[PDB]
Design a binder for this molecule. Structure first.
Ligand SMILES: CC1(C)CC(=O)CC(=O)C1
Ligand SMILES: CC1(C)CC(=O)CC(=O)C1
Lengths: 219, 225
């Protein structure tokens, strides 16, 4: 059977999966789970995925509850021979390492910041604190890109798909003005046909956050 | 080929996960200590190697891995080539990968949040009830996984069990497993593995350090032993 993707396109990791699906022409059944209504806590979804996490992919009996597993699974199933998930071991480990940086560092700090706006309203958020946290991710990422067209090397990989969606999300608030490599890379990512899958959800997130947080992002 | 170099502090559970795999596979590695409580992960030379200032960090030739789950997979592919720890069949491997990411994003994150709070605030000043809820939720999720197979990712031992057991033993210093029969049975089974010996020393050192810097005593009845 085809994969089923439980999604809310406002979430960056969801958009990373949407980008890969568009890049690889994968036929997937989308099922919307409204994160801002807490539908990930519905009894049937909790039974499927007690982590109540989105995206979730059901492919046959396989239930993937993390976007980085979904990206790797879809690349191995639908992009054999591709560069997104390289065949060479060292290159693949570099991509894997960056996917985990996105999980544990970039996305974690983005989600901490954006979740704080939702729960408390933008006025109750220590913006300077989250600016420091997320600028540190910018700094690390700028150094990753030294003499490297893409995040993990000279070729587009899953690391770029995973990072670009979250970067575009953090960038709603914190500009890339001071990071020339990051800006150049982000601009290049925006020229890929597959990046169009990021656009709708990013704008929906901007509108939702500005409403629930009672503010405007800078812009 | 150059021998792998592991930057480590055995008090960290993800470090102990790598130590367990290194012992299980008899991997010859060079160990370089980075004292997390002295702040040696912020030394200029280590920051230049890993700006995430985290252990474990592995250097193997020109490859620099800065996440324990990449280290586990890398070492499995180089030194357990064709083995079952990192399964050969695709779906089985994805299940392991999925649980490694649960450990990264959910279990270890909540463990580190709780332990970091103790270090920064002192135990008496930590919202323990808040973290008990956060970490009991991880117990619940792991119990759900174990209700459908003996090991975390299937019928046999995988990297997922190595990654999770170290952090589980750490959380369980504080929060008992009385209400989680599957997770107790699994934890007891992991404790019988010869490779589990690589978890014991760093877990005890962590208990000693936490109780001193946090100025408390873990509830002695919590730890499954
Ligand atoms: C809908 C969201 C709040 C989900 C997250 O966890 C972080 C983010 O950037 C968008
Ligand atoms: C030394 C530590 C505090 C490192 C962590 O991040 C979490 C943990 O359990 C032990």
């Amino acid at each position: 059977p085809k994969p089923i993707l439980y999604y809310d396109e406002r979430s960056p990791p969801v958009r990373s999966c949407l980008m890969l699906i568009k890049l690889l022409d994968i036929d997937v059944e989308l099922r919307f789970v409204n994160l801002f209504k807490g539908e990930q806590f519905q009894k049937d979804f909790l039974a499927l995925n007690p982590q109540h996490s989105v995206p979730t992919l059901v492919h046959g009996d396989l239930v993937l509850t993390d976007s980085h597993a979904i990206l790797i699974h879809l690349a191995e199933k639908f992009d054999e021979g591709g560069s997104l998930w390289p065949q060479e071991h060292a290159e693949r480990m570099k991509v894997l390492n960056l996917l985990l940086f996105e999980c544990s560092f970039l996305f974690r700090r983005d989600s901490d910041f954006m979740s704080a706006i939702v729960r408390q309203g933008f006025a109750n958020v220590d913006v300077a604190h989250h600016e420091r946290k997320l600028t540190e991710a910018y700094i690390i990422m700028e150094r990753y890109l030294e003499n490297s067209d893409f995040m993990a090397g000279p070729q587009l990989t899953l690391a770029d798909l995973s990072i670009v969606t979250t970067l575009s999300t953090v960038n709603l608030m914190f500009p890339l003005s001071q990071f020339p490599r990051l800006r150049r890379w982000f601009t290049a990512m925006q020229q890929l046909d597959a990046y169009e899958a990021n656009c709708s959800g990013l704008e929906k997130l901007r509108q939702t956050m500005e409403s629930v947080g009672s503010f405007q992002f800078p812009s």
